[PDB]
């Protein structure tokens, strides 16, 4: 096994890659994109602000991915602290719960595309390497976030078309419909309890 001095250096180095792990392995990516798309849907540009958008995503990605953290703790963290497992085995024991979560939250077509691009022969979907699963996961999650986000865009686009046509009906061709539609865009989101509706579906969307 690696010496004590080296294995302290190993965990210290990857302790700084924690933001990297969050963005491209857990549910942080999908929620932020959906939040960003919905922010552009209303007339407000940066009213929710970036920090609040991230703060909600960080809380959501912890509640939703809580089963993943539970399995990693009891299968990798606990055996290592009891000297029941070595450094490499503990690290591998943590990859398996996270690789399983990423594998089930991707699209077959994307994985089929990536295994062809990676040039590796794998007979079954559940045996793909993590090197090719990570790009396949984020590519599929981007498609899911765009498809979910733009469907939320549609009701706010409906309001814009209705008010713009009404203003053009009376010959008021110079009045900008966007400033008139803005109060009604906000009302639609608050009447449907939007801030609870999107998060409930986003939480339930994962598995």
């Amino acid at each position: 096994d690696y010496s004590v001095t080296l294995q302290i250096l190993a965990l210290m180095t990857m302790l700084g890659f924690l933001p990297a792990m969050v963005i491209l392995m857990t549910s942080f990516t999908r929620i932020v994109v959906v939040m960003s798309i919905l922010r552009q849907a209303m007339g407000l540009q940066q009213t929710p602000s970036n920090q609040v958008i991230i703060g909600i995503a960080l809380f959501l990605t912890f509640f939703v991915m809580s089963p993943v953290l539970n399995e990693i703790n009891d299968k990798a963290v606990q055996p290592y602290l009891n000297e029941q497992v070595t450094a490499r085995e503990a690290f591998d024991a943590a990859q398996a719960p996270m690789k399983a979560f990423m594998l089930k939250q991707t699209r077959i077509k994307d994985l089929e595309t990536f295994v062809t691009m990676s040039g590796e022969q794998v007979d079954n979907p559940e045996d793909v390497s993590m090197a090719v699963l990570i790009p396949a996961f984020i590519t599929s999650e981007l498609k899911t976030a765009f498809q979910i986000g733009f469907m939320l865009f549609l009701p706010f686009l409906i309001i814009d078309l209705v008010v713009a046509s009404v203003l053009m009906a009376m010959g008021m061709m110079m009045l900008s419909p966007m400033i008139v539609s803005l109060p009604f865009k906000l009302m639609l989101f608050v009447l449907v309890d939007g801030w609870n509706l999107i998060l409930s579906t986003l939480a339930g969307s994962f598995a």
Binding site: I23, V33, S36, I138, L142, F146
Partner: peptide, 8 residues
């Protein structure tokens, strides 16, 4: 797209 962050 403008929705996705540069980091992602």
């Amino acid at each position: 797209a403008r929705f996705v962050s540069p980091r992602i």
